[PDB]
């Protein structure tokens, strides 16, 4: 099993560090906006099945780009990430969900992720508002920190499990 | 020596035009990248793997 | 509003700073392009043909 | 049959991209933008009884180190080193271009020095005889071309292919 998973959401929310945390257990306090498109992999054992996650990443830019179709093409999973310290990143989440469904295949498993949980003091999005939006739209929901690690394995592994349950 | 108001204002005008040209060329580079990556993603997506493994 | 000398100069300093960041970004984009093309040229050079044949 | 890799080299603005489009596509553009990246186009001629494909590469004429330089020259059997005959500076730097060429290709690669933009010759800054003489003294072919009106564009690339072919057989 190889499951293509995409990372979507605003610039700055932590997509690239969630990728590097999950796939290499590495984090960079410095990272700049991503150029182009890349992917990294991690393979887990689910029951008795080896499952490779092939997780794609690009800058969270709202404008039209040529790569958008091919980015979403064949994806069976998505993490739609906002920064829980930045309310603008959450407000705009219905717009990303719009894009996902325009390009994504029908059976895509979607998890809404509020990243930067380690910055609880600068929080601008209540867990509750985000959970309910997720529940209303049939999306999974978690809060993570790529920085300290909280829920990062759980977030990617829960998506892979739900994909695996379907396939 | 101290620049006059008009000398400072000319420098600002010149910098505004340079900024416009730089923004134009950034989008040309970004558009090149995007058009190239469409071909890569479709033909040989392993090139996009991090870390790279030839 | 007729900007004062200090307001013009501040607008200039801000543009100068914007320019430095735009120049760094341009070189980041150019380096990305060069590094990607190295791999394309090694593995699948037909991607670079004009006109393109998939 | 044969595939000969040929590179275009020389200063930004001399007309490399337009010589390539004019030969391989019979197209020309007034757009003055520097080339981004690296591209190649092909044209196949018959030399004697062989079908010979010219695979001609293009990139911007930048002096600075670039990651793509080695792979750009790798495997090349010919080079057109181009200048703008209306801009003396583009000619003055020809020997720096040859130096770079011979850091990446064998010393006896077939090379043509090309003085491009001949339809602008009312504004010539490089004498035909002077560049012809330089080409002769350095073992280079030479021609003046115009990618805009086509003058000598076919001859320039077909002469390079003919020499490579002679040398290879
Ligand atoms: N405190 C904290 N910082 C984080 C966390 N995740 C990412 N960051 C920091 O947030 C900044 C942006 O992270 P990055 O992963 O590059 O964001 P991105 O979503 O990929 N941005 P873009 O879409 O432009 O490429 C970085 O300085 C990074 O170190 C986190 O969980 N906690
Ligand atoms: N009149 C005339 N103009 C030409 C000729 N060749 C190219 N040009 C024009 O000269 C300018 C630059 O040509 P171009 O082919 O882009 O040059 P280049 O050598 O590829 N430049 P770079 O190395 O930066 O990519 C363009 O505006 C082009 O239309 C020519 O033979 N005659
Ligand atoms: Mg990123
Ligand atoms: Mg060019």
From Swiss-Prot, chains B, C:
It is found in: Cell projection, Phagocytic cup; Cell membrane; Recycling endosome membrane. Residues 17-54 are annotated as: Necessary for interaction with AP2A1, RAB11A, subcellular location, endocytosis activity and homooligomerization. Coiled coil: none annotated. Residues 1-51 form the FIP-RBD domain. Homooligomerizes in a Rab11-independent manner. Forms a heterooligomeric complex with RAB11FIP4. Interacts with AP2A1, MYO5B, RAB25 and REPS1. Interacts with RAB11A and RAB11B (activated GTP-bound form). Interacts with NPC1L1. Interacts (via NPF motifs) with EHD1 and EHD3. Interacts with TICAM2; this interaction directs RAB11FIP2 to the phagosome. Interacts with RAB14 and RAB25 (GTP-bound forms). A Rab11 effector binding preferentially phosphatidylinositol 3,4,5-trisphosphate (PtdInsP3) and phosphatidic acid (PA) and acting in the regulation of the transport of vesicles from the endosomal recycling compartment (ERC) to the plasma membrane. Involved in insulin granule exocytosis. Also involved in receptor-mediated endocytosis and membrane trafficking of recycling endosomes, probably originating from clathrin-coated vesicles. Required in a complex with MYO5B and RAB11 for the transport of NPC1L1 to the plasma membrane. Also acts as a regulator of cell polarity. This is Rab11 family-interacting protein 2. The chain holds residues 449 to 502 of 512 of the full protein.
Swiss-Prot record, chain D:
It is an enzyme of class 3 (hydrolase). It comes from the Eukaryota. It is found in: Cell membrane; Cytoplasmic vesicle; Cell projection, Pseudopodium membrane. It catalyses: GTP + H2O = GDP + phosphate + H(+). Mg(2+) binds at residues 17, 35, 58. Keywords: Cell membrane, Cell projection, Cytoplasmic vesicle, GTP-binding, Hydrolase, Lipoprotein, Membrane, Methylation, Nucleotide-binding, Prenylation, Protein transport, Transport. GO terms for cellular component: cytoplasmic vesicle; extracellular exosome; Golgi apparatus; plasma membrane; pseudopodium; pseudopodium membrane; recycling endosome. GTP binds at residues 12, 15-18, 29-30, 34-35, 61, 116-117, 119, 147-148. The keyword Transport applies. Regulated by guanine nucleotide exchange factors (GEFs) which promote the exchange of bound GDP for free GTP. Regulated by GTPase activating proteins (GAPs) which increase the GTP hydrolysis activity. Inhibited by GDP dissociation inhibitors (GDIs) which prevent Rab-GDP dissociation. It is a lipid-anchor. Its main location: membrane. A motif (Switch 1) lies at residues 26-40. The keyword Nucleotide-binding applies. One of its GO terms (molecular function) is GTP binding. GO terms for biological process: epithelial cell morphogenesis; exocytosis; positive regulation of cell population proliferation; positive regulation of epithelial cell migration; protein transport; pseudopodium organization; regulation of vesicle-mediated transport. Its cofactor is Mg(2+). The small GTPases Rab are key regulators of intracellular membrane trafficking, from the formation of transport vesicles to their fusion with membranes. Rabs cycle between an inactive GDP-bound form and an active GTP-bound form that is able to recruit to membranes different set of downstream effectors directly responsible for vesicle formation, movement, tethering and fusion. RAB25 regulates epithelial cell differentiation, proliferation and survival, thereby playing key roles in tumorigenesis. Switch 1, switch 2 and the interswitch regions are characteristic of Rab GTPases and mediate the interactions with Rab downstream effectors. The switch regions undergo conformational changes upon nucleotide binding which drive interaction with specific sets of effector proteins, with most effectors only binding to GTP-bound Rab. Interacts (GTP-bound form) with RAB11FIP1, RAB11FIP2, RAB11FIP3 and RAB11FIP4. Interacts (via the hypervariable C-terminal region) with ITGB1 (via the cytoplasmic region); the interaction is GTP-dependent. Interacts with ITGAV. Associates with the integrin alpha-V/beta-1 heterodimer. Interacts with VPS33B. Belongs to the small GTPase superfamily. Rab family. This is Ras-related protein Rab-25.
């Amino acid at each position: 099993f190889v499951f293509k998973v995409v990372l979507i959401g605003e610039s700055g929310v932590g997509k690239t560090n969630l990728l590097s945390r999950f796939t290499r257990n590495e984090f960079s306090h410095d990272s700049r906006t991503t150029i182009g498109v890349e992917f990294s992999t991690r393979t887990v054992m689910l029951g008795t099945a080896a499952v490779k996650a092939q997780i794609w990443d690009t800058a969270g830019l709202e404008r039209y780009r040529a790569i958008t179709s091919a980015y979403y093409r064949g994806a069976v999973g998505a993490l739609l990430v906002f920064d829980l310290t930045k309310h603008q990143t959450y407000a705009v989440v219905e717009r990303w969900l719009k894009e996902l469904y325009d390009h994504a295949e029908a059976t895509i498993v979607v998890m809404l992720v509020g990243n930067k949980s380690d910055l609880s003091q600068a929080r601008e999005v209540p867990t509750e508002e985000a959970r309910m939006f997720a529940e209303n739209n049939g999306l999974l929901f978690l809060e993570t920190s790529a920085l300290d690690s909280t829920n990062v394995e759980l977030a990617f592994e829960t998506v892979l499990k739900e994909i695996f349950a379907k396939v | 020596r101290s620049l006059t108001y008009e000398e400072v204002l000319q420098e600002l005008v010149k910098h505004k035009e340079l900024l416009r040209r730089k923004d134009t060329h950034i989008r040309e580079l970004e558009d090149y990248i995007d058009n190239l990556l469409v071909r890569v993603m479709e033909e040989t997506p392993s090139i996009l793997r991090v870390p790279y493994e030839p």
